[PDB]
């Protein structure tokens with residue numbers, strides 16, 4: 001909408017106070033004009049029609065329980081925008097400052113979040129499996145990264161390309177979480193998963209097997225569930241990424257870590273310059289090696305470590 005840029009204040013899903021960029025025109029809307037062509041947050045009102053209504057508030061204060069998922073969807077979209085712009089010189093998901101749209105309060109007791117081809121969508125959770133999913137910065141960044149992937153490599157959402165797609169979203173979800181630097185880790189969704197159980201998460205990049213996901217190509221899933229295991233086989237690539245960044249010895253193969261920033265540069269370049277819609281794991285290895293070669297040189301430690309990491313997870 002047309003209006004003037006304002007700054008509201010509210011509380012997120014975890015009870016933390018934050019400022020948010022709003023727009024005033026009769027109401028205060030969750031419309032942040034400070035980033036690209038805007039970040040817009042909508043109320044789906046427990047229904048499934050999208051996007052719903054642009055979030056309107058009378059007083060620019062967002063402290064109601066009902067407000068919390070909107071505050072976080074809006075704020076964490078801003079953090080994710082900032083990560084891509086400041087770290088990778090990418091302007092929004094399409095590289096041309098496309099408006100970023102999110103809807104919260106999607107459906108009833110909805111234990112998921114997704115990119116629907118055009119916007120981000122967040123359930124509230126059922127209160128047991130999940131609390132409102134926009135409370136997780138890694139979740140918000142995971143979702144926006146699906147848009148980045150779709151506009152770039154275009155990895156088809158099934159089988160190995162789909163597992164790469166998923167891992168890309170977990171990798172950048174995590175790198176955004178580290179960028180914001182509040183309780184960062186290499187787990188996925190820990191801030192919103194199972195409020196009654198401490199110390200768990202949906203997936204682990206550092207040890208995928210802790211939640212039953214494969215950490216080696218010989219353990220890949222080849223059945224039909226989950227689009228051919230896109231959230232399962234992502235563990236193989238997540239583990240490779242974790243090893244590239246942090247190092248370790250895995251099934252007897254030692255990897256020299258090169259740190260998060262270089263992991264991000266290598267994978268961002270692979271995603272945007274080398275991967276294609278049908279890339280498989282072997283082709284991802286080749287894309288990562290080439291990306292590291294471009295950035296650091298063929299004789300570099302960075303190239304050597306990429307090779308070691310893919311060796312460790314059984315991908316040649």
Ligand SMILES: CC(C)C[C@H](NP(=O)(O)CNC(=O)OCc1ccccc1)C(=O)N[C@H](C(=O)O)C(C)(C)C
Nearest residue numbers: 111112113114115116117133139142143189202231
């Ligand atoms: C980070 C996490 C909190 C949320 C994450 N959602 P997504 O974006 O990968 C789900 N997207 C999806 O299924 O794409 C289908 C589609 C395709 C095209 C248009 C619209 C929809 C996830 O990991 N979900 C898991 C699962 O769905 O298996 C879950 C529930 C954690 C077990």
Ligand SMILES: [Ca+2]
Nearest residue numbers: 057059061062
């Ligand atoms: Ca209010």
Ligand SMILES: [Ca+2]
Nearest residue numbers: 183184185190
């Ligand atoms: Ca965390």
Ligand SMILES: [Ca+2]
Nearest residue numbers: 138187188189
């Ligand atoms: Ca995390």
Ligand SMILES: [Ca+2]
Nearest residue numbers: 193194195197
């Ligand atoms: Ca938990």
Ligand SMILES: [Zn+2]
Nearest residue numbers: 142146166169
């Ligand atoms: Zn995903």
